[PDB]
Structures are given as C-alpha cells and as structure tokens.
Design a protein around this nucleic acid. Structure first.
Length: 186
DNA sequence: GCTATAAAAGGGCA
DNA sequence: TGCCCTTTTATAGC
C-alpha cells in the first residue's frame, strides 16, 4: 500500500503497553491468594503480576485499582486483554469498572534489508543520534517530529518506540527511510 | 542472562 | 521531591 507507505515497508507492531482504571481500591493479598494466574511480592514490586494466554499479555494490578497491561501485539488486543483482567478482578468480588483505557506505548520493528553505515549516520545527525557501539550495538535516534525513538542496527533492522498512535510509528519510519538509504553501507 | 529504548503504574528511600 | 524498581518487546553485542 504505497499511498500510505511510500517506502513500501510497514513496521510490524511488537508490543503494546496500555493502562486502565478499574475504579475501585483492590486487595492485592486477597487477589494473589485467590487468583491462580497471579504473582505478588510486595517487597519486590507493589503490584500483583497476572497473565493470560490470549491475547498473551502480562498485567500489573495495583492496590489503587489502576492497571498496566503489557505484551499485546495490537491496540485492540491490548484493550481486549485489559478487559479480560477487569472481569477476573470483578469475579474475585471487586466492583471493577473500566475507566480511562489508554494506549501508552506501541513498539514496532521492520527490516530495510540493506546494511547501514551507523557512524556516518551518527556524524551527520549528531543532534539526534547517540551511538556508542562498544556499549550497545544500535544507534539511538531520537526523532523530534514525531517525538519517536528509533534503534538502528547495521543489519538494516530497526526498532521504533514511544508511539501513542500507530501512525506516529509509521511516520517516524517513513521519515527515517531516506536517511537510512543515504547511509547505506556498500 | 545481560548493555539500550519507550511507556505506565506506586512504594521506598536518600 | 524524584529515581529505581517491575513488566513487555523488537534489535545485537558481550
């Protein structure tokens, strides 16, 4: 679909983090006792860690009724999964609602299929680049428009994070594509 | 398994 | 007051 993706490449979404407000105070101890699919070491982290198989995700349930859903491959799957946790808490006897569901971060990745001269890229876009190969092999490109972070590897493989809307993921990628080509490694 | 990246939630502690 | 922690995921190196 070249009209939307002129590069002819569409980043595949890998992880969605969403949050929602169950709207009631929760008893984390009771929940970890009753819950089966739930983990809870208050000493290590203040939340019950619960997981479901479909959509395969992990939820962090807090005493406040606030919740973080993680691991889904799309926004709808993220909402669905958050909804499943809500019913699990409702059925544990808590009046869980579903308030202010919000997608907080979308992670995508794609492959341009040509290698990149990272040091060159880093040198010419130094105001956005951060590249210490001896520490981490990818170059961190913090794009300003949209405010997105791309991890660029010499392999031609790229990771795009920090999006709240999938179109930001798509645009950051289309924005970086002519740049990747400019620094293709021959 | 562990360098790095985004993001949310909240308890502890300096 | 504010950071670290915990969780997820692609990527690639030690």
């Amino acid at each position: 679909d070249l009209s939307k993706h002129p590069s002819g490449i569409v980043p595949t979404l890998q992880n969605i983090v969403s949050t929602v407000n169950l709207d009631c105070k929760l008893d984390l101890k009771a929940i970890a006792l009753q819950a089966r699919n739930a983990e809870y070491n208050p000493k290590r982290f203040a939340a019950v860690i619960m997981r479901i198989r479909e959509p395969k995700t992990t939820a962090l349930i807090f005493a406040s009724g606030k919740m973080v859903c993680t691991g889904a491959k799309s926004e709808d799957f993220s909402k669905m999964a958050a909804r499943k946790y809500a019913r699990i808490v409702q059925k544990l006897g808590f009046p869980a609602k579903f308030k202010d569901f919000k997608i907080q971060n979308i992670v995508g990745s794609c492959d341009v299929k040509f290698p990149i001269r990272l040091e060159g890229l880093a040198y010419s876009h130094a105001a956005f680049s951060s590249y210490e190969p001896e520490l981490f092999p990818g170059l961190i490109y913090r794009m300003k428009v949209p405010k997105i972070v791309l991890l660029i590897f010499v392999s031609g493989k790229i990771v795009i994070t920090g999006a709240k809307m999938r179109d930001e993921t798509y645009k950051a990628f289309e924005n970086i594509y002519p740049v990747l080509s400019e620094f293709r490694k021959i």
